[PDB]
Amino acid sequence: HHWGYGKHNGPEHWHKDFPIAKGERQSPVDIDTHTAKYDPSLKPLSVSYDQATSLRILNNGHAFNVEFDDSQDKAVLKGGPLDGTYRLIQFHFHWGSLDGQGSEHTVDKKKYAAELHLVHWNTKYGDFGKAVQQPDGLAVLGIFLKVGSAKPGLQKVVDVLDSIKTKGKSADFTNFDPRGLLPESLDYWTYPGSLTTPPLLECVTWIVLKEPISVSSEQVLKFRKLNFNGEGEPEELMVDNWRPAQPLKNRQIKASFK
Ligand SMILES: CCCSc1c(F)c(F)c(S(=O)(=O)NC)c(F)c1F
Ligand code: NA
Ligand code: NA
Ligand SMILES: [Zn+2]
């Protein structure tokens, strides 16, 4: 009876195994764009993905992860609200059963069809597993997806999904360029928060881009043909793998833009 996204083991249950679910800096949150504080001293975000090395794509039973070689400073995030250098380890998405829901963060209570999370760890701490135990261990770049025109830089990911349909499947995934998933503007909101799946550790500086990317209905339909179950177990479509907005508590969301 492990955690997942249903009536009996979904987000409202997670606090029984992970009590930090009711903690003081949990994610996601609703971003109130009118009450976000413009901070004219926030720097532009530096996304340096030219040398990125993807390796593999994996269905972990919760989402699919595109994994990168993070054994050298090859794909890094810095600047923005960050001190120090954070290495890209993987990205994944959260999405809905319908185009009207799927994102974890919301903007003035608006839900997007999906949300991309590019996960990075602070080189300070030497690897991802040590970094998640630190309050400034991770920087997650969050990008909303709306349904409209196709994102051509997403199609290599969508086309491989049929090979990792079920939990525990993986496939080689080299030479994928994550710059193809970025919108034109790097204007962002930022706040201190947490992982949005168990263990829900409060180790994340969240950086949420204001501009969504558009993907087609066909692209997101393909995400919804994945499965949460293993091969030869009964079919449960991988849809609605998002945690809803959590209380902001004693936090201020800062904006890089007016
Ligand atoms: C061993 C490498 C896995 S790194 C990972 C992940 F797989 C994940 F799902 C989330 S999330 O809580 O689901 N989105 C915030 C993360 F934050 C992560 F950092
Ligand atoms: Na190279
Ligand atoms: Na690692
Ligand atoms: Zn995520």
Describe the structure in your own words.
The chain is mostly beta strands and 258 residues long. The chain has one domain. 7% of the residues lie in helices and 29% in strands. Strands 2, 3, 4, 5, 6, 7, 9, 10, 11, 12, 13, 14 and 15 form a 13-stranded mixed beta sheet that branches. A two-stranded parallel sheet has the order 1-8. A hairpin with a 6-residue loop joins strand 6 and strand 7. The longest helix has 7 residues. The chain starts with 29 loop residues before the first strand and ends with a strand. It binds the ligand CCCSc1c(F)c(F)c(S(=O)(=O)NC)c(F)c1F, sodium ion (2 copies) and zinc ion. The site of one sodium ion has 3 residues, from helix 1. One sodium ion (NA) binds next to helix 1. The PDB classes it as lyase. The entry lists the keywords benzenesulfonamide, metal-binding, lyase-lyase inhibitor complex, lyase. The assembly is monomeric. The entry is titled "Human carbonic anhydrase II in complex with 2,3,5,6-tetrafluoro-N-methyl-4-propylsulfanyl-benzenesulfonamide". The protein: carbonic anhydrase 2.
